[PDB]
Symmetry: C2
Subunit: 206 residues, 2 copies
């Protein structure tokens, strides 16, 4: 009776979806006020977020170049927020910088908005398959002269700030912005103080 | 002022922890009847779980031996229960088998209970650090004569069923049971249908 089983599984997957949506809303309700309070504290701590970014594992460190790191020292805060009620997986990632040698003063807050939507795509023999698609508008950054950290061609390996130009709309792209978005929103941001504290208690190699 | 900030962060971490526990409880509350209904369905689909296990990736395949596969061909269900009301991260993982040549009939359900616990240890500086530890009691499997898949000693590269002998309290066993527990409970079990459907896709184009 496999036909019935898999039809029932499909029905059940829909219920799982509705439950996940309820959980996301509950999560946003409980954690956002705490993240807001945390944000006010973290802004007072020198180099908090650059230490966190470089201690969070390979998913981030694979992108961070020495030139990136210098700018990130002026990163005052990172905030992550699920802003779209009608699409609760959508995330806004905001980086707030102090004045620095890379960014013009009228562009010290870098905002990345990632739309995360259920889509479908024909597979093998033309069967529809549910996929979660991650897309975003490209974010133009007002770099000071000679200080742009945007690659112009994809011969160059992507650095951290290439994330802002990632759209998720290119078959081309080698930059896995979807995985980075998930890591930032679900791992790095919620566990920031732990990452910082672990980094501040790291020992030498010798 | 670093001192006041970090004191405040530590207090806030406690609130984050409480929120996290509440979310996990809510998540279990919504997902449990759905996973239970799914379990009854999957029970009817022969070789569902061996296909899922073989499609899971290196996290599983690194343990799977030819003899493991034979026994896993008789695997009827994998069920994950968060049984501890106080600690929603605790998991009871049950592997149910059809009658086979490896297991005595009185031991066709292999139950693994893994308990987590926020522990504490001093670093070389002298300061206590918070460490999340995964522990479990060894499970006595009633093998049929000369069919034990437990390794003789902690020397030969471990197979999948050595997991039931993993405790997490041995100073050096090479079996990373903590990672396997997490993968089973958070990845393989929730995404099982997708793993199965995808595997069936791929071996239908060949």
């Amino acid at each position: 009776e496999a036909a019935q089983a898999f039809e029932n599984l499909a029905n059940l997957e829909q219920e799982f979806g509705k439950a996940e949506i309820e959980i996301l809303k509950k999560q946003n309700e409980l954690f956002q006020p705490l993240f807001e309070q945390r944000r006010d504290i973290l802004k007072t701590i020198n180099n908090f977020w650059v230490v966190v970014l470089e201690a969070a594992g390979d998913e981030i460190s694979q992108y961070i170049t020495p030139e990136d790191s210098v700018l990130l020292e002026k990163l005052e805060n990172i905030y992550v927020e699920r802003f779209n009620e009608k699409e609760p997986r959508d995330v806004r990632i905001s980086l707030t910088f102090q004045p620095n040698e890379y960014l013009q003063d009228d562009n010290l807050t870098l905002v990345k908005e990632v739309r995360i939507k259920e889509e479908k795509a024909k597979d093998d023999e033309g069967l529809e398959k549910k996929i979660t698609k991650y897309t975003s508008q490209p974010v133009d950054i007002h770099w000071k002269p000679g200080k742009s950290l945007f690659r112009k061609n994809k011969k160059l390996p992507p650095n951290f700030f290439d994330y802002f130009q990632w759209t998720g709309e290119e078959e081309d792209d080698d930059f896995d912005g979807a995985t980075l978005t998930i890591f930032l929103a679900e791992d790095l941001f919620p566990n920031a103080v732990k990452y910082f504290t672990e980094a501040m208690t790291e020992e030498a190699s010798d």
